[PDB]
Each structure stands twice: as structure tokens, then as C-alpha cells.
Design a binder for these strands. Sequence first.
RNA 1: UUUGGCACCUCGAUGUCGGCUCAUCGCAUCCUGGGGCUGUAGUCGGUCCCAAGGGUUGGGCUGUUCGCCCAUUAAAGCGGUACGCGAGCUGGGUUCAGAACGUCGUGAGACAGUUCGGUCCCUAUCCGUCGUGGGCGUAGGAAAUUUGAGAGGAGCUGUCCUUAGUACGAGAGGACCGGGAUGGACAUACCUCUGGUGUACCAGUUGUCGUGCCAACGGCAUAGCUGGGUAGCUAUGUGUGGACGGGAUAAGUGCUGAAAGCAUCUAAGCAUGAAGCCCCCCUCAAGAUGAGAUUUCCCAACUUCGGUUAUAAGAUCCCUCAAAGAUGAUGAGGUUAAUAGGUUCGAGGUGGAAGCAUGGUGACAUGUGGAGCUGACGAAUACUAAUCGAUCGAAGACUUAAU
RNA 2: UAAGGAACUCGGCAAAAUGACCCCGUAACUUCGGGAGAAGGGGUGCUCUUUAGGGUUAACGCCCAGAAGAGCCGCAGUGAA
Lengths: 215, 48, 122, 114, 120
Amino acid sequence: TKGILGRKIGMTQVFGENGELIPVTVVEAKENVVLQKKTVEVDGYNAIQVGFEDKKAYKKDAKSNKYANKPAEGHAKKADAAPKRFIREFRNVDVDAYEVGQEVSVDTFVAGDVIDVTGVSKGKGFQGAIKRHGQSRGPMSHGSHFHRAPGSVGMASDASRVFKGQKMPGRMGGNTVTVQNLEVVQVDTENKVILVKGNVPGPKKGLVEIRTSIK
Amino acid sequence: AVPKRRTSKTRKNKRRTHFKISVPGMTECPNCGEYKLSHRVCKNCGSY
Amino acid sequence: MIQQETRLKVADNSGAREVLTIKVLGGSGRKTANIGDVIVCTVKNATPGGVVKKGDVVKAVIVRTKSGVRRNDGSYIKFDENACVIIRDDKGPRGTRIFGPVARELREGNFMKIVSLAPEVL
Amino acid sequence: TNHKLIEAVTKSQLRTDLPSFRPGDTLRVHVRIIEGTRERIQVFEGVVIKRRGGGVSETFTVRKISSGVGVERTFPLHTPKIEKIEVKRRGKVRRAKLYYLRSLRGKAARIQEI
Amino acid sequence: YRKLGRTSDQRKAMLRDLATSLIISERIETTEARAKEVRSVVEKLITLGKKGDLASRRNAAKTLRNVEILNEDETTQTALQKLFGEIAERYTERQGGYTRILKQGPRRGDGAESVIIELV
RNA sequence: UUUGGCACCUCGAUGUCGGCUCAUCGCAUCCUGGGGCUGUAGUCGGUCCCAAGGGUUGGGCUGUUCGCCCAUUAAAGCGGUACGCGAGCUGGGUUCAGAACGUCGUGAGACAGUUCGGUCCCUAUCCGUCGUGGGCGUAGGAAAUUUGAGAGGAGCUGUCCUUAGUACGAGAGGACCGGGAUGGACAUACCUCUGGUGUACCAGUUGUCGUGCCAACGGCAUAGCUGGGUAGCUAUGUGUGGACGGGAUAAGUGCUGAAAGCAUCUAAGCAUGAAGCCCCCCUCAAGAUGAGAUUUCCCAACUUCGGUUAUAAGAUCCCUCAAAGAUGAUGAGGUUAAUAGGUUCGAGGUGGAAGCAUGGUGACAUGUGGAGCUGACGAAUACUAAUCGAUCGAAGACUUAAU
RNA sequence: UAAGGAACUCGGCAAAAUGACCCCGUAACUUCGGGAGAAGGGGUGCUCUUUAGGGUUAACGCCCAGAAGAGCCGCAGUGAA
């Protein structure tokens, strides 16, 4: 249960009890609202839909995603709310505890709550096997002409082919990844921020989904 | 390293289906002269 | 950060001066050791007389590495050289006189005799 | 605002009782040791080698020589494990990072006062 | 930042050559990327000229090349003198800008995006 | 999987051994797991059965395959895949030209018994693999949020404290069962800390040429060298993960119970039972042609609204850019505007500018003054540029049954 | 390029390190020539004094100094090659 969205701001450190140092990620969880409530009798599964960051109203002759379109405006009109940048669903919550139009406030979370955090990895691009996987590099001396290539990719006439999942070069970067069992250090309601123990995936000013751990 | 079979006309012209030129923008010069290139005050009578 | 083939000064009066390390024990694949960790080693340069003689295979505990240690308060400590003390397979030393300073992380490994014999403990 | 959040959130973890010092100055750091027995206190006297960082991530390093062996100790500036800092002596140096002291001994590793 | 397909010293020298020629002529024809880089250089030079002090004059002479202009009325001055006399007076009240890029069509020998860059 | 026998493909060429890189399969199980028996008191051990999920070290002497040794480890398993892998790498071995020892030979020369030395080519057409786009489809057209048929990944293990010096044991020794903290290796994310780099940042310094000279600056000397270092990228740094739990089962233990008045774990029935199977965890996923679901938006003037000029919702061309990136995509923005630049102010970095004055014979020092300078980081400000525009874009069929 | 320092590999292959000038000192073994530049140590910038050398010498001045003192700066003075 207890899901929210936020933007990654950066990393700092804080001091706990008995002077211990705690590296911390600060997350701006601001103006989250509920836009829709999906149900088993209608949509086939219970979930709420949450919108996080407000954008500009509809405008004729608009070219960017800073300005809402007519569908998004109508969707955010049912709930007496503004249009939002990011929309995500949460299935882990109890659906009856929330109401359409409700504001999801950061004070849902309190210190000591263990959480899971989801986000897209940073982005690196076309990378080789030494970096994209943990492959060893060949000798750099003694007559070698094999440094950063991948080695053999198959055996021989028997299996005259390459199997799938052979770990070749390619794009490495943004894929969604959760880290499990991080905890909340404190909450500041006036600036609407959460402090998470550790580090979370993604670049700065990037979306993160915080929710409660199962275990 | 070398091709084992020659390439047929079919395969060649299939490969050559994305090998072409796009069309430019051609915002017609409201000021004067020939039609201006978009976001370009063209040397040949453009007023972008 | 002590791996295989590193050389360490010895900080006791057991008889050895220089020592070469053969193995970082613990688990399989253990590559590097640091303060508080036990190693097996050879004596490459000994003092005349002394208990231990050149060519002997012995066990030692690492004290005062150069790539030192972090602590839970975020403090760090480092030294200017790497050193060790030779032990009697009971966390006790073969010598009776420790030299130089010693880290405070030895208390967590039950090396109280070395900590007591030492000068300044940091 | 999106740029003052880190400062605003880490303002409370910051200390004000610390004095001003720069590299070269000789410091006496009183650090509290919460051993298994009690909450003892121990002093560490040496020369400031390195100051760096910002705000709460700020950090400084001091160096001394105990028994013929050089010893460097690095603290966060705003940690509560430091009871007290004293500036015993002021130095004269033309450099922000005194890494050249690591390969000296004796009168060569002496610093003019003021 | 841009490397312009050149080494560090070649890039530095070409940038200050571009800036000097622009101070001389007040509009020049070049490529898009070179213009987008020399823009900041010449703007900082004009900022120094507006400050006017001796130290700024020296920090600008660090960059500018020593070139003589044939001014009207048979008069002669340097690019530094022009920068600190006229170009600073023209923009004493303006806060930023000072340059405008105007795109043109591609060249013949290449397909390079040609551009004019002009003082304003 | 050996040494061989045969001589069926290949002599208009099917690369020989070791080693490196990269794997994948089997079980005839090295460790971990579960059990029966024991000439198993406990601690252990031996043997047999089940079982392939994961894991299965670094060095010395070896060309060496093989083998011996040193130190660890929970363990240092056996095999197959052209004795896996040279259009992926070496080239130590053997064997080509040179030369030498020993032996043999009248000799030219030979042995294969030794020894020193001795050139490893290839711009990927098809299949295949790793990524990433365009077109069309999915009974109206679109924006967004999703279900999950399937698929992939993950799966290891130790030491310590207590139970308890208790059970057992003459004693030495010494538990099961359970509870509790920390580690090794591996994988993943990130740069707050520690450090690396940081060729448009700051300082010091040598030679030489120039700016008429001084001074200051600039050029070349690996970025001339040296000392530091922001953003970003990073590990050796910082965090997180797995040993859980449900079902069904193997070996095996059983309950009830006949066939066969007894007995029997089995035939019918009821239970328990493993790191193994499925689910649970993470990720991809309606090209899932079976093409799915929810919310919202739009709808023609003629017109079998077919075809039409139109056109709407919505996209795109073009342009300023980066949290993205080979290109293309992706995302942030396009004057009702802070997208980039500039400007101003900061942060951090360097470490005390110039000029003036004073002191000193002079090299130099002190003060004005945490000075001055500052790439990528942050905020603010429309000074500059993101112009005027153009294009594309639908008209919810038929059949039956309900209504 | 942190820590480590041949653990790589058939093999320290390659790279790193040494490197100029001045002074001090230098083994075994030798065919007495050598080895030997053995090894191994130390020093080098700028300024003012001079008492004074190569002397520019006419003389300290004109350059290196006989090179002896006294100072200045810097992480580093054959500060690069």
C-alpha cells in the first residue's frame, strides 16, 4: 500500500542517532492527486491512478507537452483538478481508502517505513561487452590483438548458430529497475520532500515511484 | 567476408526502398522573390 | 588493501622485520585484506637471534594500513605505511612489545592483548 | 523553488559553534568515543592538510606523527562526535592542499607561523 | 562544448581569429557551429570593453590579435582600440546579446550550413 | 570420453596441441539439501538411495596435455559439444629452409634422441545473434493509463552468540532441534563520502621568438613541465538483493485396509515429506493477425457523406536544446515563451590579481583585500535566436439474436 | 591512474625507471692493458658581499667565478627537450 510519486532532486548526507552518517536521496513529492479509481467490476482489477506534476491548461496553437490537450483536460476535469505531467497506477493500495480528487500528501509516509523505489536507469548508449556486461579484457601485451572484443560466441558445426542471450554489445541505459527495502529517514511537509536512505535509480529531476515493500 | 551468392534484382531493390530523399519544407516567401527555405533568409530571394 | 605478494613491516619484537603475504583467508576468492584481518605470510628479512627465522611460514594480523578505514560516523583514518603483527593462533602475539600506533578496530576482533601492549590507539 | 531544498532540509544538521580555520593551521580536535564502557573523550592534535566540500558534505583532514609514523584523520566538519575544536597555531602556506607533507620528516616538515 | 573537428590549440587560435575579424568587419560569413561558439567569445570581449579598466584591457589583449584597421579619414587604429572606444559606447546601455546569427543556404563544395553573424 | 580395428565423406586444402576470451548440455553428485543401514555411544565417519538449482581458488616447477608441491576453500566433481571455440587472440609446442652435440651410415645424409633461431591473410552477401528504426495491420479517427497468453532473469555459502558444556559420554570430548548479528563471492543502482580522470578552470616555473623598451601578455616546446581541481564518467567508494512462504511431488516414513478370516504403506482411500517442478520476487510483453480492456477528446456543406474541396481532435515538417542519443528515435521548449546563449548574482575550485603605498641596497616581503580569475553546476533577467507559415489527418460496414 | 608491485606471461615482450655537468669514492678477477662511467653517495636556482681566481685582467669592474660567506622564493632549481 501507500504509494506516491516524486522527482529526484539529488543526494546529500544526514546525521542520525549516535552520530552515524547516513547517505540520503531527497525526493520532491508535490501536488500529487487522484484522477481515477479502477475497479474489478469495470476495469477488471482494483487500482488508483495518480497524477503528480501540474502543467498548463489547454491553448490553441500549442506545440509542446507543457500545455495539456483536450483529452487530458477532460480526464483531469472529472476530478476537480488540473492536468498533470506524469500519470501512474498503484495496485498495492486499498482502493476504498481513497477518493477521486483527493490529495496524496507526503505525510502518508513516516520515518521507519521500509519502501521500494522504482525508476528508469540513467542512460549510457551503445556500449560494449566490457561495460554492458562484466566481461574480462584480453591481454594488453605479449603480442595480443584481442583487447575489448567479446570472445567466441558459439562452438562449432554442432549448433551451427548462435544461441539467444549471447551478451553482445548494444544499448545500455534507461530501463526501469526497483530497489527493495530502503527506509524513510524523515519527512518535511513544508517543502514536501522525502529523505530516502541510500540511492535510487535515475538522473536528477527524474520521475520516481515510491511504494511500500511487501517484505 | 565475400558474398557466396550474387544478389538478385528483387533483393537489391528491396534494400533500396528506404534509400531516397525527403522533401524540403518550402515556406513560400511572403516578402518577395523566390520561395524561401524555412528559417533561412535564402541567398536566392528568401525572407525567413 | 593487502593482497597476495604485498610486503609489510612488522611492528613487534618477535624477530622479523619484513614479511611477505601468501594468502588472505576467509572465503574462496577473497582478494584483499585490511585492518583486523588475518593473513598467512613468510619472513623475508629477520633480525639476528629472535624467535622466528627467515623462511618461516607464520600467521599475522594487519595493523595500520595506508588505505585505511571508514567508520560509521563517516570519519576516516589512514597511515603512511602498512604493518602487521605475528600471532600465536589464539589472537595472542609471539612478541611482548608492539611498536608504532594501532587502529581502534582491533577491539572488535578480540585483539585486546595487542591493544593493551600498544602505544596510542586510534 | 527547486534549488534550495537540499540546503533547507540539511540546515538543521549544521553546526555554528565551530571556529574558522584554513589549511596550515594547527588544530586540537576533541572527539568523543562511545566505547562499550562509557562516553570517553580523546584529543587529536595536528596540521590541517585538506578542506573540501560544501554545506553538510564538508570535510577536513588533519595529519600528525605519533611514534615515527604519519597518521591522517578525516572528519565531517559538522559531525556531533566532535565536542570541541581549538586553533592552537596559525600557519603561512601558499597552497590549498598540503599533500607534499606526506613525503617529508623533521625540519623539512615545519611550517612558518602566521 | 564543441570541438569543431580541431585540436585544442587550433581551436583556440581559430576562435580568436574569428573574433578579431568580426570586430574588424561587423559581419562575417562562416559555419553554424563556429558562429555559435565565437558568439560567447566576442560577447565576453564586449563585456570587458564596457568595463573599460586597464585589467580588462589586458585580459582582452590576451585574446585579440594585433591588427591595424584603415579607418575613414586616413586614420588607423587597432581592434583593441575600436573595441574599447566605439563598440563599448554602442552597447553601454544594452545588457547582453550584441550578436545575431542569420542562417543562409548550404555551400556548393560541401553541404555545410552557412551562416552570417553580425553585431547589433 | 582411451589405445586400436575398418577405410564410408573430404587431398581443383575439413587449421595440428596447449593456453586466453566466451559459453552451453548431461549426471555416472565435489559442496550445499533430503533420507535408509551401520562393526553409527556423542563428535564424527563408511556405504547406499533421491536430486543437476546454484556454486565449484590463487600460486611455484612444467611446452607441456599429465603430474608433484605451497597455501586456502563449503567444495577445489567427471565428461560432451570438429579431443567446443585461431574468418575471436596468442604461437610456448611440432615442423620448413640455418647451425651444433651424441648415435648410425663408405658417403650424400638419416634419427626423431637432444639444442639455439625461425612471416599466423580476409572491407561480412545469406542464415544466426545483440540492439535500434520505418511501413501496414488490429470495422471510425486520436491522447493517455493498463490487463497479461507467453518469455527472460534470480536461485550460492560461511563464521560468531544463545539454546547448552545441555542430550550423549568412564572421560576425553560434545549435539540435534530452534532462535539470534555479521561476513566471502556474485548481481544490480548511484556519486553524498573516500579516491581516479578532468587537453576552453586557478596558480608556479624553464628555454626561445614577438608585441619598439620596462613590466605584463601571447606563440612553440607531450596539455612544455609541475601542484591542485568543478560538472560529467567512474571503483577500489556508497546502498540494495538472495537463506522466506505456499501448493504438488521424488527417495523414504506412515494411518486405515482387503485381495489371501491373519499380516501387509496400496489395489481403492487419508497424511507427511527435499536447495529440485509450479507459484510467490524483478524485467520485457496484444504483430497474443486470438491483434484485448478503461477514461477522455473529435465528428460534413454537398454527399449511395463513396468522391470531393474541405476540415476538427491530433500529429508532423522547421527551429532552440538535453535527464536522451551512432543516425533515427526519446524527452525538455518554440514570444500567451526562461529551450539555449548572453548579462547579473551565487555555489564550488584555485589561493592573495593589477595599480598604488610602505619596508628592504637587492633578490623579495607587507597592506589596500578570503583579493582577483573561473568550462560544463544553480537562480534571476527576453538583450539575441527559437519568425510568417505549409502539409497530413475521420466520416463508426454487413449477417443474426436480443432490445 | 588510488592500494599493491611481475602476482602477468613460454619468457619482465612492451612500457616504466636511469640519463647532462661538478665533486667524493670504487670489489672480485686479470693476459697487468683492464674491469670501470664498476658499484655506491652528494651537489646544481636567484640576490648581495670579496678576500680572488680562468683573469676581461689594466682590476675588483667586462663574462665565468677561486669558489668562501650571508640571504630570498618555491611542491620541485641540468625546474622544458
